[PDB]
Motif scaffolding. Sequence first.
Motif, short mmCIF file in Angstrom:
data_model
loop_
_atom_site.label_atom_id
_atom_site.label_comp_id
_atom_site.label_asym_id
_atom_site.label_seq_id
_atom_site.Cartn_x
_atom_site.Cartn_y
_atom_site.Cartn_z
N UNK A 196 2.72 63.17 -5.43
CA UNK A 196 3.60 63.94 -4.57
C UNK A 196 4.94 64.23 -5.22
N UNK A 197 5.53 65.35 -4.83
CA UNK A 197 6.86 65.72 -5.26
C UNK A 197 7.64 66.22 -4.05
N UNK A 198 8.86 65.74 -3.82
CA UNK A 198 9.59 66.12 -2.62
C UNK A 198 9.87 67.61 -2.59
N UNK A 199 9.82 68.19 -1.39
CA UNK A 199 10.04 69.61 -1.21
C UNK A 199 11.23 69.96 -0.35
N UNK A 200 11.72 69.05 0.48
CA UNK A 200 12.87 69.32 1.33
C UNK A 200 14.15 69.15 0.53
N UNK A 201 15.29 69.14 1.21
CA UNK A 201 16.59 69.05 0.57
C UNK A 201 17.18 67.67 0.77
N UNK A 202 17.61 67.04 -0.32
CA UNK A 202 18.23 65.73 -0.25
C UNK A 202 19.71 65.85 0.05
N UNK A 203 20.18 65.05 1.01
CA UNK A 203 21.57 65.12 1.44
C UNK A 203 22.33 63.83 1.22
N UNK A 204 21.67 62.69 1.05
CA UNK A 204 22.35 61.43 0.80
C UNK A 204 22.36 61.13 -0.69
N UNK A 205 23.54 60.81 -1.22
CA UNK A 205 23.69 60.62 -2.66
C UNK A 205 23.01 59.33 -3.09
N UNK A 206 22.24 59.41 -4.16
CA UNK A 206 21.49 58.29 -4.65
C UNK A 206 20.06 58.22 -4.16
N UNK A 207 19.74 58.91 -3.08
CA UNK A 207 18.38 59.03 -2.59
C UNK A 207 17.85 60.40 -2.95
N UNK A 208 16.75 60.43 -3.69
CA UNK A 208 16.24 61.66 -4.25
C UNK A 208 16.32 61.75 -5.76
N UNK A 209 16.64 60.66 -6.45
CA UNK A 209 16.66 60.68 -7.90
C UNK A 209 15.25 60.70 -8.48
N UNK A 210 14.28 60.16 -7.75
CA UNK A 210 12.92 60.07 -8.24
C UNK A 210 12.21 61.39 -8.01
N UNK A 211 11.74 62.02 -9.09
CA UNK A 211 11.18 63.36 -9.00
C UNK A 211 9.76 63.37 -8.44
N UNK A 212 8.97 62.33 -8.68
CA UNK A 212 7.58 62.36 -8.28
C UNK A 212 7.10 60.96 -7.92
N UNK A 213 6.38 60.86 -6.81
CA UNK A 213 5.79 59.62 -6.35
C UNK A 213 4.29 59.67 -6.58
N UNK A 214 3.72 58.58 -7.08
CA UNK A 214 2.35 58.55 -7.58
C UNK A 214 1.55 57.51 -6.81
N UNK A 215 0.38 57.91 -6.33
CA UNK A 215 -0.53 56.94 -5.74
C UNK A 215 -0.14 56.47 -4.36
N UNK A 216 0.05 55.15 -4.21
CA UNK A 216 0.29 54.59 -2.89
C UNK A 216 1.70 54.86 -2.39
N UNK A 217 2.67 55.06 -3.29
CA UNK A 217 4.02 55.37 -2.84
C UNK A 217 4.19 56.82 -2.45
N UNK A 218 3.22 57.68 -2.75
CA UNK A 218 3.22 59.05 -2.26
C UNK A 218 2.35 59.22 -1.03
N UNK A 219 1.63 58.17 -0.63
CA UNK A 219 0.86 58.22 0.59
C UNK A 219 1.67 57.68 1.76
N UNK A 220 2.65 56.81 1.48
CA UNK A 220 3.57 56.35 2.50
C UNK A 220 4.63 57.39 2.82
N UNK A 221 5.17 58.05 1.79
CA UNK A 221 6.22 59.05 1.94
C UNK A 221 5.68 60.45 2.08
N UNK A 222 4.44 60.62 2.53
CA UNK A 222 3.83 61.94 2.51
C UNK A 222 4.47 62.91 3.48
N UNK A 223 5.35 62.44 4.36
CA UNK A 223 5.98 63.34 5.31
C UNK A 223 6.90 64.35 4.66
N UNK A 224 7.38 64.06 3.45
CA UNK A 224 8.35 64.91 2.78
C UNK A 224 7.88 65.29 1.38
N UNK A 225 6.56 65.32 1.17
CA UNK A 225 6.01 65.59 -0.15
C UNK A 225 4.87 66.60 -0.05
#
Lengths: 159, 159, 370, 370, 370
Positions: free
Chosen positions: E32-61
């Motif tokens: 997964x790769x985030x598609x929305x807009x990040x507004x809090x500084x320091x959150x959103x540095x990670x460009x791509x989530x792989x495997x199980x960490x992209x299945x938990x955060x799938x709401x924004x990927x």
Amino acid sequence: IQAQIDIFKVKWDETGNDIISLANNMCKIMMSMTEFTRGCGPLKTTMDVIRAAQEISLNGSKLNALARQIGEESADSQTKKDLLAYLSQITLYCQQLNICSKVKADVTQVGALDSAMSLIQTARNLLTAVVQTVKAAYIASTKFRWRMAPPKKQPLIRP
Amino acid sequence: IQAQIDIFKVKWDETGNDIISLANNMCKIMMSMTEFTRGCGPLKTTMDVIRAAQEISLNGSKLNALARQIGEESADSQTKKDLLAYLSQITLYCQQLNICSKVKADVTQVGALDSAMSLIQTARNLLTAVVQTVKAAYIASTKFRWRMAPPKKQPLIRP
Amino acid sequence: TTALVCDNGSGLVKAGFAGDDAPRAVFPSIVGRPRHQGVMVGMGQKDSYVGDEAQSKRGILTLKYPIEHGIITNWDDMEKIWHHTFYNELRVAPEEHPTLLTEAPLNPKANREKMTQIMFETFNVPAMYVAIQAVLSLYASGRTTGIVLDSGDGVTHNVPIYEGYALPHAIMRLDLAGRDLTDYLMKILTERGYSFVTTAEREIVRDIKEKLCYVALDFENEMATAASSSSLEKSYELPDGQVITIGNERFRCPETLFQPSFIGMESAGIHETTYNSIMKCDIDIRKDLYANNVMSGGTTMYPGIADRMQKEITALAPSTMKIKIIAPPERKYSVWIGGSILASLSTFQQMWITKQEYDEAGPSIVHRKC
Amino acid sequence: TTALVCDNGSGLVKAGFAGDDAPRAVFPSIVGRPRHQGVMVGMGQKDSYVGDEAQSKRGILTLKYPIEHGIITNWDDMEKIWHHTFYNELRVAPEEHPTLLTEAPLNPKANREKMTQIMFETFNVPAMYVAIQAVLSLYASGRTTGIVLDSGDGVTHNVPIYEGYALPHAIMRLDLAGRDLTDYLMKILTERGYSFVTTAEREIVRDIKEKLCYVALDFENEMATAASSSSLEKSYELPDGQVITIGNERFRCPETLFQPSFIGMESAGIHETTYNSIMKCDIDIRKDLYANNVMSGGTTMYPGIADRMQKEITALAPSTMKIKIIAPPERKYSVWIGGSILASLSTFQQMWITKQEYDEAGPSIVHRKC
Amino acid sequence: TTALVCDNGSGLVKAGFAGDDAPRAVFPSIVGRPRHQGVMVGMGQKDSYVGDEAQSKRGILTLKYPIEHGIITNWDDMEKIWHHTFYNELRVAPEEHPTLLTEAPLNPKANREKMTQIMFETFNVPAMYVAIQAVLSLYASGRTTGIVLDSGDGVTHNVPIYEGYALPHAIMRLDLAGRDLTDYLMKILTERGYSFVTTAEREIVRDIKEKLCYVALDFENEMATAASSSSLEKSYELPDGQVITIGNERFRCPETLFQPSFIGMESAGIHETTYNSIMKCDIDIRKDLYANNVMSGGTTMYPGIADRMQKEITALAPSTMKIKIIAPPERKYSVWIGGSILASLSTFQQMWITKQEYDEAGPSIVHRKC
Ligand SMILES: Nc1ncnc2c1ncn2[C@@H]1O[C@H](COP(=O)(O)OP(=O)(O)O)[C@@H](O)[C@H]1O
Ligand SMILES: Nc1ncnc2c1ncn2[C@@H]1O[C@H](COP(=O)(O)OP(=O)(O)O)[C@@H](O)[C@H]1O
Ligand SMILES: Nc1ncnc2c1ncn2[C@@H]1O[C@H](COP(=O)(O)OP(=O)(O)O)[C@@H](O)[C@H]1O
Ligand SMILES: [Mg+2]
Ligand SMILES: [Mg+2]
Ligand SMILES: [Mg+2]
């Protein structure tokens, strides 16, 4: 969250002990505050929860510095980028913990559980971003050019 | 399309002449509209193309009636079923030509080539479904219980 | 007798008689109800205004569309709309006319079942039929082989057809349509300072979108041109004399179709949807589908959508194939003209769902027949 | 140096230094000008009183708010307000401090462009930044996943955020806020006999609203209780010794938020606005947005608004999901505390709009940076 | 040392150590790769989530499978997946472990060549090997004579083997698998009213398919039973508290395997494919292939697929032969257990593609060795 640290057994091996000790202190304080949430725990006053939150913030700053040192020691890789992302998250959470702890202290002094609910939530966010900082730092320092046991076997049949 | 009719040389032999004459008129109007597409032709205004399309539709209705008469005169066979299928196709194409011609007339009156492109396409579909209606009707009326020359020899070597 | 052809779209209702070439009634599909307080006796007895009489009095009403994304959310209001269409606009008793209704593909089955039940039990029509809209658009386009992009106010769907044989596995229904573009235009209009919030002001913004908005051939170049100079600004005059001015919002509103990420949707634009629908069909018919891209529906009438869509598809299709988009000038009414062609056919008169069949088999006959 | 955090709301200006936990200056955002005739020589040389010195002398002034619905209508008065804030209240030279200004979402772009131009050309700040208010409220709430209802004096807006990723298509800005409630309270106060018409009397009515008004859990039951008995009547003493008594106007004024049809507005209440903003977000994050409803801003401090809003949302959300409204006791200053958290971050110091960048790119840099 | 066994399927990655009996890491093969807009500084540095960490955060990927029909379409994403598997999940340095990868039959040759090149140049493994999946399933089934139906998420293929001698001319690879069933379930779910369109909603529909869908023994009788009564309806609760109800879609989704004409495919079902693969083998071994129909892969775990497949084959095979389908309860992991059996053999350790051989002969050695 405790289990991820608990699989640690005894660059890295020079600053590793400090980081694992800091994370263990964080988890101990975290379940202190969790037990406060459940009702029975070492600390029972909201002032105690604020002091614990400030302590977790201080430990977070220390662990952030150590992990940054390991991160710049290591070589370019994907785990290094994950580590840097988690460091930024830890920085944000520590700043939140500091300022919100001061605000809750003033609110309580001017004259309950919901006052400590948000501090517990922020500290729990901080802790979740640490157990992913120790692992990323360990892998970046070691596997690229303490210990963690290999993962347990996944069940063949899930009931 | 013209060649399929051009191999006709002089039930069937009672209503055959009418059908072949109608198909020949259809082909004449068809290449009228085709020459309009290429730029030089007897008719040069889009209104003329709409009139030609309505004329082809009228000829299609007449040929449909004649071929239906031959089809019910004939006996059960596979060519009869092919003939009935082609009659249904002619009915659909004639209805399309009528309504689309009226629509294009109104569009042109309210105030170019692409207006006549679809009318030419529908008339060409209609014509393709006629040269398969004359042949099926001829075979169903004659071979079962004008003329068409036997097909030309296929080349032995194709370069 | 003569059959009715009621193309109850999501935004406009277009009714008429089969065999004609133009609808008799074309009115918006809204049902307003007054919200203020009536103070003069005798004025205010009418509880709800339907269609054109709720578009004139919209200053004191809350207009509510009964059909929403092609799916009829409100059924009492849609009975009101159908009663208006049959009696007050067309002025025909439904008992004497078969009715040909239209419907987008991939809708719920309860939608067809309840349209059939309402027609056969409330309006007592002698026969009916529910036809997919893109099939009728291909009828009215004068062909039998094409891929029918059919935008509108509710949905935007493709139906690829090759020589009268539709390919149901390549039907791609997208829920981005004119109303989403209206709402996005309201959103981006808030930037200049103009805030339209009410429903009547939704109708004002819809009129702004129809009059001014167009589709850019190259988006980045047009944004650069709009930022560099004020040659793209055009003014519109509101119903109270105020004048607005939108320069950059003109091609940003209809660009949502080609980049549905503007309004937060994930799906691909209409060009990629059409191309994906083409390359889901069998290999032999893709050449014939490339050359016949019939565009229908109201939303496909932005100035410059045919050229832009041809440019976008040509960059996806192989360099050899001939891409050409068919955009008839009457494409707003293509579905209804197709309904006129279909309902007046000699062959078709055995395919109506007669009232006796509905009595025998219930409202589930529409799934077998249609 | 140390950064300033000036949260110039529509009704109150709250300034301070970044890194602190409480503002230094909290004064109303008004600019009074005397209207009567001066007769004593030497008294009356001052043309305009700003902030707290125009709230003391309001007996002889026409107070005028420069910011109106979150949009700065008057710019000379707002320069006066900023000059007051920087020099007379905080007592800092702006040339040595970066300034973090706040702004509601979906405002005009000229608003940000002119705030940036005024800060960089009139006050000569070395850097600045304009941050949406609900993002800062979520900063100060100690979370990263919630839906931030942020009422105030100008606007009432939601910003749904999931793990630091805001969803710009689900931001719902409503223009109903504290000032509309003040005007409605004046209107319904005319029923009892009390007529407040002037601006100073608007301030008296605002104080009545703050002291006495509350939100009813069940509106009909509370109206029945208020009509049956006089147990709900509470008295207030005006600045000239008169005593008023409002029994039924106490919960009718803040009920405008949940039924904006009281003041003639069409839009849905704040509960339906929050629920609609939740169900515009992706399906997987609605459970996390339901459980974190951060409420901010002054207007959300009516006694009993959290319980009522939880009751209203719980009746809309599915019966399984856990709804809980987060209402910190300091929620009036949540936006500013978020500004302190954001401006003092180590990560943030690369995101200021430096003066050199403004010189290069003009006032349109604020759209890229912010 | 100890060899790795990475069975990178099209839908799930199952890795472990050779000689064990269960994988250590079992996570989805998504990036997964985030598609929305990040507004809090320091959150959103990670460009791509792989495997199980992209299945938990799938709401924004936007989850994107790199392997598609058993063929690796995206190679950077698959390097990401392999890096995740080696370092973050198994936690082993690849330089010290041989790796046994799996692959469906009849794939492109560039697929094996690039897997070998990536393992020997990016991960620096000391040895590797690429094994067909149905051979490993027959290893783990405890036999040496059978016909291995191996469904999955990408492909569905048979490999008939008689006493260790595979028959390469009777290998029948069909491209109908779990993902096509998920997409068809989405399509037929649109009938009831539920519209899942995004990728996260593809994952929700996949979970619905796993929990509820089953295979009917007799399709027509089950359709009659489902239409007559509501005894077949079962409810599922979406991640936002909504409850759905699918009664007839339960056995229509997995019926696509036995009638691939549901999704527009021409090829015969899996029963006719298995029978055709049997009667392409030599006459003497058809009796032994009839009695050992090893079924593997995830997609063959629908409740009632063994009984239905036995009924379908028994109607094709001669009345004398004994048909019995072997469906181990662990058949989801049969390929990996076969990899454990193969990689830990004493005989096998001379068949690894050593790094020295790759240096000598380039990536085309995998065609000779494997
Ligand atoms: N000239 C135009 N330019 C741009 N958009 C238009 C134009 N005319 C109509 N529309 C859009 O199309 C919609 C009407 O489409 P319509 O033909 O009614 O489809 P349906 O009948 O399926 O509702 C309107 O909501 C409007 O937004
Ligand atoms: N205790 C209170 N109870 C009810 N309403 C209040 C209270 N305090 C302030 N308000 C309302 O909130 C407004 C001030 O909101 P504020 O926090 O200044 O928002 P902003 O800073 O965005 O203007 C005032 O106009 C007042 O009407
Ligand atoms: N219990 C189940 N019932 C039905 N289908 C299942 C079940 N478990 C998994 N599947 C399907 O099987 C797929 C996973 O197959 P998998 O074993 O990963 O094959 P591969 O490893 O070759 O990708 C999933 O996409 C899912 O659709
Ligand atoms: Mg339409
Ligand atoms: Mg505010
Ligand atoms: Mg598999």
